[PDB]
Swiss-Prot record, chains D, E:
Top-rank lineage group of the source organism: Eukaryota
MF terms (GO), sorted A to Z: ATP binding; proton-transporting ATPase activity, rotational mechanism
Species assigned in the record: Rattus norvegicus (Rat)
Binding annotation for ATP: 353
Membrane topology value: Peripheral membrane protein
Stated role: Non-catalytic subunit of the V1 complex of vacuolar(H+)-ATPase (V-ATPase), a multisubunit enzyme composed of a peripheral complex (V1) that hydrolyzes ATP and a membrane integral complex (V0) that translocates protons. V-ATPase is responsible for acidifying and maintaining the pH of intracellular compartments and in some cell types, is targeted to the plasma membrane, where it is responsible for acidifying the extracellular environment.
Tissues with expression: Expressed in brain (at protein level).
UniProt keyword annotations, A-Z: ATP-binding, Cell membrane, Cytoplasm, Cytoplasmic vesicle, Hydrogen ion transport, Ion transport, Membrane, Nucleotide-binding, Synapse, Transport
Protein name: V-type proton ATPase subunit B, brain isoform
Subcellular location: Apical cell membrane; Melanosome; Cytoplasm; Cytoplasmic vesicle, Secretory vesicle, Synaptic vesicle membrane
């Protein structure tokens, strides 16, 4: 008799496959066994991984019912871990705390349909941005996106994803808008980047979010954009003096706007 | 006014009755004969097959 | 090991000394090794439908007995590849032979074994880890768009005794190697899968997300969904003209598989010329459509067996990319030509036909093809949900609605975008006849609409009601006369004209109407139905009152409002952003309300 | 009981389409069920389509692909297809061949019944009499179904005949002024609609009554042939042995006719009328006529076959022979469907021959027949008045014409238009009918005897 | 090359219509060519239709009359039909079998090419976008032909399809912002038609560039099975090897289909519709799909089959399966011919599927597509108005309906109607189209964008 459309042999192979994948996910998001509640909640499947077995042994156990062999329940339980691992990996440099991880797990498990959850959509958007930036080459679009996604990962680690923080929603929307905008709309890319750095409550958003070299490169990018169409070499030297700033800042952008208005009068 | 309306209605009634008679004595019989012929010819096609 | 040819009759060979051969097994007939498939067994003789021209095949010719059925090589290299009906790569044939002819018995590999592929294993895997069929054990950077996820073949399983490190590997290099029951199976990046076998999935889930074509009529009145099963007429002006390329350029789908079952010569040339030149905006860059499209080209003069297997090859590739977690939109250029191939092969086999000469199993074959569509929780441990959305094109003789292929289609497909010959003659494109065309996915799409486009469902209901009322009123207007119409009937007729000419009429060659976003569709329909409701309110309320309002009064007062509603279709999403279009439609609604307030 | 061992043959003489022609068979039995093992171990079922001498032509349920001579084995079970029937298969989902697809266990048989059954004795059948309420006003109040009637639903492709079938399955029951069961058979039903049926019945909580047989479009067609016979064997067990009033809904008999055509072509028989078997009338009669009340047993089997009229042609062989065999018709209209009325059941062309036996005092109510007749008359007059208004204009209409138009609108908006999950008891349907009849004054209700108007018209 | 001596068999085992079944054949080769020496020395040729062990069902091109068993000597050439092809085949007349009938010598082969043709890789087939200015406004204006297209002429008995084909042949030329070489394949054309075409080519001075294949009505009817392929083979040689822009005319695909049906019925194959072989689609496709351009080459093969629709039925299997393959159809109407219009091209059912990419700015003109679309729309509406007038009378027609009727009259009088020797450039055809569209006000030309109405209407 077919189960879920698969021949029973394939179903009982999929059961052991899911068990192995759950074990791998646990080893990935918690090699040190810090997440004790999660370990307890999944202990019935990780028993077959902590203790060493053969593939055929676990398959036989599943065929005899010793293993948890409800492939739908196993699929749900594995999807929870997979989503948690996606959250952990998407912010891999900006790891979060244990209590936050466990709260996110609990909200997952409570969710009726985790695949359709708004949590899943937010993770998809974050993975979209990260995948775009994994092999991206330097350009104002890509640099602004990298900085904005680093700060987005920081906020995600701070507040998780189950809480629809307004700042995180703004970061998602602005990052996606910048991503979708054409590479030739340079003025619009700079407009959105400067609007973000303006609307962030923190006066200097990227103080600790980015390495120093990238902060200086961002400052250089803004200075270079301000450079063309400057009526005086003195104003260009003032731009160079502003270039001494270690990182972008609201006041730095205001100084750029001040010089821009000076040139507006002078031009 | 009554007699003018009377003449106009007489003409319109004659025209509309002519239309109805033309339909039910020329057009509908034509289509019925066409349908009978089509049914017979499809029967012939089935017989040949 | 190998039999001999006993007789030949067109594509139907009969090979002797085939005692142990299996049904639908592949064989190589002749000294040129023409591909053939065993379709019948009689003692020690096997009848073989040959996939190439059999001219020159003589009795006594060897018949090599390969042990596998008609199967496709699924792996890196499918994307951007143009394939014959049986997976033969036309571009590779041209490059290798340096001639414009397809040599008989050509045996070039479907997937090139010389291209170095950037392979990155799933980092969490290791030696000894348990894996099963469908497990994504590595990812190949096929191109900038499609990340080719290397999945363990279904019906394969075991403990990974070796996983290759990240690097560059051929399509023939052994990339993974796993042991089960002591037997070691070595897997490269290409897996061979029979075309006639349904690729297994964990669970076929309901389809609950629209598959947006570019047309307002199709998106609103007769929605399609991801994993849907649609039937579309192959009439000229519509179909291949806009809908196929519109689905290609932009839609919810992540991959396109396009199979030319019985395409005409120059029309297939048109497809093969246009597709490699279409581009799409992805992550702010214009990228070729070939980066996520594959074509299975099968011209009408190619062998009928290939024409029969073309649909199966296409749907198998679509299923393969569905298992990856992608949403593959498949287009069958003609299931009618497929049915013609089935009829011809049945006649050659001397089987008893059903009505109109088709084999009595035509419905079964159409079901086996269409039902392979759907949204699925793909096999394999890494959770993912793919879908295959089949759009099968039908073209009955003389637009016959009782054509056995069309009748068999309508009992399977959930969507059917029927053809109005009158609209086509009038040059009303799309020529969908909204009175018999249907879509059974509206109920499933209620959940999506009541959350994303909450106000759209009543608009669609009122639009359908208005169109049916116009259909009922036009018979009477033409049979008797237009003088006896009530005011509400006039509102219905003129609003139906408005909707038909400027909401259901979409020219797909213009920069502004090539693809109509669903926000544009729902906004336009909202404006038209708001005008309908408010005008009917005016005429009804002022009825039985001294200051009576009639359709003529409304039309004369606000010809500008009607003109603006008519020009609503001209909004161009590319330059008139979504916010701009929504604001303009809100302004039109405000003007309508103000003008009716002045009238009232 | 069959004690003798089963014989397994490797003597496969040929393979042709879906048929495996085996040779050297020991006394082959026609219609025998035979389990064949492919060279790679895949197991398939088959039925002996034809027998001759020592040969046996086994139509394999699945395809013949992969089957070969010299290695494919074939074990002859020694008996025709017998299904295990019990009361526990009420609340289960089975495929076309009876294998559960709800992840439950195999049926623990109370009996092993031959699916082909036997014709109910005419002298033992009894006139259906009382009513089975479907909760749908358009057929409770105007086309009511008697306990033992066979009343098909006619529709075309794309109309909501499957949704109406699901609604009837969820709402069907006795008038009630645990002896009711439903046997739902779905044939050639695509995966989306099969999932719709299964999930709907499971969710709405009526599964305790429903035995569901699902034959998907891509499941074997011989399974489609044997699906209605499985369903009706279960219905006969539940009705004539367990004594409960069963309602059998057989969905898309057009798909069953297509499967019959395929099997006929497999037998190498020449096509009959319009490409269908010549004996299709007998086969449809065999299916439908397994219904009705019987003498000395308190159970019954009502039937509601559902048809997809191809090309909307009432002269097509399937609807034609169904009307010849059955006792009514419920028309699903494309015009009402386009106008967005649900259920789009047209009450003018529809009919229920045995409505009179299903209504009246003690069965539904005193005024059921009169209300139904008056509603039909007023509906027809309303359609006529709409046609007239379309020519003369609204002003030229008299007061009675306006009343008839109002009744037509409110009848299509309140009586017909129901909503999928609106279950109306027949008393509720009659109350709505009286609300609609109270549009007219007592005098224009000429088809309702004054004895009934004096009692039900007021209020 | 084949050096082994050929085998001659006096072993004829049966004669049945056009078929000659031989036995005891040493390794029969399918599609092999056989030379039958009759008892009286008459030499005929045939093609092996099928082989079964030592049997061979030859199909004689010249007919089996006079053939006897025990004395007819069938010498098996050991190879498929490889016709000789040379550039000097232009300006020659051959019968259906390729032999000279102009009193010239046999073709001195430049090469030996298989008549079945060599399939062309779709990856390297150029899409034809060059318009052919046939000079016929009914084709140029609304059903334009692109160089490399397959577009038949659907007609019936007694209509001037031969005259239209001759006009296209003598007027075909590219649009002015390389002269065509004509290859002719007459199948079943009476002496009058063949003489007409030959005289038309000689009179117009094109005979040096015309190669005729004549299979008159009196000629054998199995010979016309190879007559088109031969022609097409030559076309291919002239087009893809000699770099010549070829135009292939195939006079009667209906007669070729009748020959196919004759051979099929002789073979007792399972028939298709109307008795035609089930494989008529593939046999017709192998002929039609040989048109078009290819990469690297400079020549092309424009293909213009001509069909005689039986009973004027465009649903007949021959025209039906020709529409499925060829890219459009030019449709000659019996009503227009009866009304003395020439060319009697009915533009409603005819279309050219490669017109969209052949017309437009740069190719012909900006307004071509819009003018054609609006002319077609107005013509269809005028035909509907005429049908309505025939029933209700002209006095009930509105002003716009009278405008549509006037457009229809002037369209069939000025646009479709045309002298047999008058070639209207595409620009003159479009000017006539605009003069006819100006009958309507700009508000009624719905299918023409305002950007073009403002530029071309006011003139």
């Amino acid at each position: 008799i077919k189960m879920g459309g698969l021949t029973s042999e394939q179903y009982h192979s999929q059961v052991v496959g899911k068990i192995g994948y759950i074990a791998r996910c646990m080893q990935t998001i918690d090699p040190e066994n810090n997440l004790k509640k999660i370990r307890e909640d999944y202990q019935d499947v990780l028993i077959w991984a902590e203790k060493n077995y053969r593939f055929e042994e676990i398959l036989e156990a599943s065929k005899s019912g010793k293993c948890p062999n409800d492939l739908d329940a196993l699929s749900r339980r594995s999807l929870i871990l997979q989503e948690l691992l996606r959250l952990v990996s998407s912010i891999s440099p900006f790891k979060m705390k244990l209590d936050l991880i466990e709260s996110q797990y609990e909200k997952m498990k409570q969710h009726v349909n985790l695949w359709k959850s708004d949590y899943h959509v937010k993770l998809n958007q974050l993975n979209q941005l990260t995948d775009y930036l994994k092999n991206a080459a330097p350009t104002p679009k890509n640099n602004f996106l990298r900085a904005m996604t680093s700060v987005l990962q920081m906020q995600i680690a701070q507040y998780g994803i189950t809480e629809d923080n307004e700042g995180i929603n703004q970061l998602f929307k602005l990052g996606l808008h910048l991503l979708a905008m054409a590479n030739e709309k340079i003025d619009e890319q700079y407009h959105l980047f400067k609007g973000y750095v303006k609307d962030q409550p923190e006066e200097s958003p990227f103080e600790g979010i980015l390495p120093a070299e990238d902060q200086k490169i961002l400052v250089k990018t803004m200075i270079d954009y301000a450079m063309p169409k400057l009526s005086s070499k003195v104003l260009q030297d003032k731009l160079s003096a502003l270039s001494s700033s270690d990182v972008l800042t609201k006041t730095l952008l205001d100084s750029i706007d001040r010089i821009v208005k000076e040139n507006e009068k002078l031009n | 006014s009554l007699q003018t309306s009377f003449v106009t209605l007489d003409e319109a009634i004659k025209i509309t009755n002519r239309r109805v008679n033309a339909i039910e004595h020329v057009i509908i019989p034509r289509i019925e004969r066409t349908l009978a012929y089509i049914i017979t010819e499809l029967d012939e096609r089935e017989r040949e097959e | 090991t190998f039999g001999y040819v006993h007789g030949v009759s067109g594509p139907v060979v009969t090979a002797c000394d085939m005692a142990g051969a299996a049904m639908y097994e592949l064989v190589r007939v002749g000294h040129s090794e023409l591909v053939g498939e065993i379709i019948r067994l009689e003692g020690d003789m096997a009848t073989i439908q040959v996939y190439e021209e059999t001219s020159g095949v003589s009795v006594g010719d060897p018949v090599l007995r390969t042990g596998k059925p008609l199967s496709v090589e699924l792996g890196p290299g499918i994307m951007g590849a143009i394939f014959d009906g049986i997976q033969r790569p036309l571009s590779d044939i041209s490059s290798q032979t340096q001639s414009i002819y397809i040599p008989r018995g050509v045996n070039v590999s479907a997937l090139s074994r010389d291209i170095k592929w950037e392979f990155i294993p799933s980092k969490n895997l290791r030696v000894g880890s348990h894996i099963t069929g469908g497990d994504i054990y590595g990812i190949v950077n096929e191109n900038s768009l499609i990340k080719h996820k290397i999945m363990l073949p279904p019906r394969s399983r075991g403990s990974v005794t070796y996983i290759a490190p990240p690097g560059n590997y051929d399509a023939s290099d052994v990339v993974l190697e796993l042991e089960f029951e002591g037997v070691k199976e070595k897997l490269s990046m290409v897996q061979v899968w029979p075309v006639r076998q349904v690729r297994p999935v964990t669970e076929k889930l309901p389809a609950n997300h629209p598959l947006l074509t570019g047309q307002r009529v199709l998106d609103a009145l007769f929605p399609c969904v991801q994993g849907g099963t649609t039937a579309i007429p192959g009439a000229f002006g519509c179909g291949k003209t806009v809908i196929s390329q519109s689905l290609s350029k932009y839609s919810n789908s992540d991959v396109i598989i396009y199979v030319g079952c019985g395409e005409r010569g120059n029309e297939m040339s048109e497809v093969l010329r246009d597709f490699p030149e279409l581009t799409m905006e992805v992550d702010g860059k214009v990228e070729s459509i070939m980066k996520r499209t594959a074509l299975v080209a099968n011209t009408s003069n190619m062998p009928v067996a290939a024409r029969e297997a073309s649909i199966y090859t296409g749907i198998t590739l679509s299923e393969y990319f569905r298992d990856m977690g992608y949403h593959v939109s498949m287009m069958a250029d003609s299931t009618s030509r497929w049915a013609e191939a089935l009829r011809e092969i049945s006649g050659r086999l001397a089987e008893m036909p059903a009505d109109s000469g088709y084999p009595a199993y035509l419905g079964a074959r159409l079901a086996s093809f269409y039902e392979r569509a759907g949204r699925v929780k793909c096999l394999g441990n890494p959770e993912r949900e793919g879908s295959v959305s089949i759009v099968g094109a039908v073209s009955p003789p003389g637009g016959d609605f009782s054509d056995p292929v069309t009748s068999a289609t309508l009992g399977i497909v959930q969507v059917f975008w029927g053809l109005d010959k009158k609209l086509a003659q009038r040059k009303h494109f799309p020529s969908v006849n909204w009175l018999i065309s249907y879509s059974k996915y509206m109920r499933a799409l209620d959940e999506y609409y009541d959350k994303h486009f909450t106000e759209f469902v009543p608009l669609r209901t009122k639009a359908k009601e208005i169109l049916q009322e116009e259909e009922d009123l036009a018979e009477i207007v033409q049979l008797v006369g237009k003088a006896s119409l009530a005011e509400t009937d006039k509102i219905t007729l003129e609003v139906a004209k408005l909707i038909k000419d400027d909401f259901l009429q979409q020219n797909g060659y213009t920069p502004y109407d090539r693809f109509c976003p669903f926000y544009k569709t729902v906004g336009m329909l909202s404006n038209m139905i708001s005008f309908y409701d408010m005008a009917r309110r005016a005429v009804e309320t002022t009825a039985q009152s001294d200051n009576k309002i009639t359709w003529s009064i409304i039309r004369e007062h606000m010809g500008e409002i009607l003109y603006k509603l008519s020009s609503m279709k001209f909004k161009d999403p590319v330059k008139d952003g979504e916010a701009k279009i929504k604001a303009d439609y809100a302004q039109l609604l405000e003007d309508m309300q103000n003008a009716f307030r002045s009238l009232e | 009981y069959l004690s003798q061992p089963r014989l397994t043959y490797k003597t496969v003489s040929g393979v042709n389409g879906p048929l495996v022609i085996l040779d050297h068979v020991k006394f082959p039995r026609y219609a025998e069920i035979v389990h064949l093992t492919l060279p790679d171990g895949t197991k398939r079922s088959g039925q002996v389509l034809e027998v001759s001498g020592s040969k046996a032509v086994v139509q394999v349920f699945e395809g013949t692909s992969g089957i070969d001579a010299k290695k494919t084995s074939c074990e002859f079970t020694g008996d025709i297809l017998r299904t295990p029937v019990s009361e526990d298969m009420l609340g289960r989902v089975f495929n076309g061949s009876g294998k559960p697809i709800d992840r439950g266990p195999v049926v623990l048989a109370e009996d092993f019944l031959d699916i082909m059954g036997q014709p109910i004795n005419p002298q033992c059948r009894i006139y259906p009499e009382e009513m089975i309420q479907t909760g749908i006003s358009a057929i409770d109040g105007m086309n009511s179904i008697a306990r033992g009637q066979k009343i098909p639903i006619f529709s075309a492709a794309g109309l909501p005949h499957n949704e109406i079938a699901a609604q009837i399955c969820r709402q069907a029951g006795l008038v009630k002024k645990e002896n009711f069961a439903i046997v739902f058979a779905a044939m050639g039903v695509n995966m989306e609609t099969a999932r719709f049926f299964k999930s709907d019945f499971e969710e709405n909580g009526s599964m305790d009554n429903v035995c569901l047989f699902l034959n998907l479009a891509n499941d074997p067609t011989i399974e489609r042939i044997i699906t209605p016979r499985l369903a009706l064997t279960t219905a006969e067990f539940l009705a004539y042995q367990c004594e409960k009033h069963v309602l059998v809904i057989l969905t898309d008999m057009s798909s069953y006719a297509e499967a019959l055509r395929e099997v006929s072509a497999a037998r190498e028989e020449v096509p009959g009328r319009r490409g269908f078997p010549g004996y299709m009338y007998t086969d449809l009669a065999t299916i439908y006529e397994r219904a009705g009340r019987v003498e000395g047993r308190n159970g019954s089997i009502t039937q509601i076959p559902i048809l997809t009229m191809p090309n909307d042609d009432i002269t097509h062989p399937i609807p034609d022979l169904t009307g010849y065999i059955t006792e009514g018709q419920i028309y699903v209209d494309r015009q009402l469907h386009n106008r967005q009325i649900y259920p789009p059941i047209n009450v003018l062309p529809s009919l229920s021959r045995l409505m009179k036996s299903a209504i009246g005092e003690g069965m539904t109510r005193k005024d059921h027949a009169d209300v139904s007749n008056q509603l039909y008359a007023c509906y027809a007059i309303g359609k006529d008045v709409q046609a007239m208004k379309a020519v003369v204009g609204e002003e030229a209409l008299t007061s009675d014409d306006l009343l008839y138009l109002e009744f037509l609108q409110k009848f299509e908006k309140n009586f017909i238009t129901q909503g999928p999950y609106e279950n109306r008891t027949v008393y509720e349907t009659l109350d709505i009918g009286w609300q609609l009849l109270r549009i007219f004054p007592k005098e224009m209700l000429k088809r309702i005897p004054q004895s009934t108007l004096s009692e039900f018209y007021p209020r």
